[PDB]
């Protein structure tokens, strides 16, 4: 959801800090919010995506550098009579970004450029380790500080590669603690309001 540059306390778990934006959990949470928020407009009607439509779009932010509204249209098989609610369309307006895993592809590009990963391969790093990386580069900005956070968690050549290319900032409103419980409810096809009430 909303993002800001200063760290802060979580609104649901007040003892925990806000999750960094450029983490696997936060980017997946932002994607799930968008995915479940998306509505289709057509001939005066409004509708949300079917669970099939959402599942078809799910993994596409993770395989192309970017998910625009146009590729979503093509992949969903929408007719020209169908349009995306929220998109202003008074501009190609569907060239706009629907979702971009900036952190996922930043880490990939860093490992690819140094020779530790192939170009169109998926990122061979656990979600938890992607989270620690995004956190470290968001709370700390020097090699020394960042190394102190990651030196015992990931391999030396990987850290060298990240130190040479990665630059992250901004935080979401929810801690990683609450997100790691809200997200897999949103993955089963639940909205942001159900998951929060279901848990808090």
């Amino acid at each position: 959801d909303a993002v800001q540059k200063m760290l802060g306390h979580c609104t649901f778990e007040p003892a925990e800090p806000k999750a960094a934006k450029n983490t696997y959990t936060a980017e997946r949470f932002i994607w799930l919010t968008k995915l479940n928020n998306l509505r289709i407009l057509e001939q005066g009607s409004e509708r949300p995506l079917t669970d099939t439509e959402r599942a078809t779009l799910m993994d596409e932010p993770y395989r192309k550098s970017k998910l625009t509204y146009a590729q979503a249209r093509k992949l969903l098989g929408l007719e020209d009579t169908a349009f995306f609610k929220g998109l202003r369309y008074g501009k190609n307006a569907e060239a706009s970004t629907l979702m971009e895993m900036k952190a996922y592809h930043a880490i990939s590009r860093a490992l690819e450029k140094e020779g530790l990963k192939d170009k169109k391969s998926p990122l061979n790093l656990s979600p938890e380790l992607q989270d620690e990386i995004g956190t470290a580069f968001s709370l700390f900005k020097t090699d020394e500080d960042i190394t102190g956070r990651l030196k015992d968690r990931i391999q030396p050549e990987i850290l060298e590669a990240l130190l040479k290319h990665i630059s992250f900032d901004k935080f979401v409103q929810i801690s990683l603690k609450a997100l790691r419980r809200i997200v897999p409810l949103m993955e089963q096809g639940k909205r942001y309001d159900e998951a929060c009430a279901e848990i808090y």
Binding site: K5, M6, L7, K141, T142, D145, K164, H165, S167
Partner: protein, 88 residues
């Protein structure tokens, strides 16, 4: 009290930023500007490595100078706020 690169994010929080709301406008606004300026400079301190036109050694110097300036800015914001009675 003391700002370093390694406690910057722990002190430049929105909770601490909201503590400045006890200050009158002509003391609050400059401190808020320094605070936010430090946050912005700290946040983008590694952007030089995203630039493939900069060598990694050159991006290092720029990274170090940007973090040091952000630390100086936040230290000033905290110092000026402490002189008006705010405790961190």
């Amino acid at each position: 009290m003391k700002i370093t690169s390694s406690n910057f994010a722990t002190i430049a929080t929105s909770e601490n930023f909201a503590k400045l709301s006890v200050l009158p406008k002509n003391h609050r606004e400059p401190i808020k500007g320094l605070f936010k300026s430090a946050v912005e400079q700290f946040s983008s301190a590694r952007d030089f490595f995203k630039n493939e036109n900069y060598s990694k050694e050159l991006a290092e110097k720029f990274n170090k100078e940007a973090v040091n300036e952000a630390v100086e800015k936040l230290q000033k914001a905290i110092d000026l706020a402490e002189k008006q009675g705010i405790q961190f």
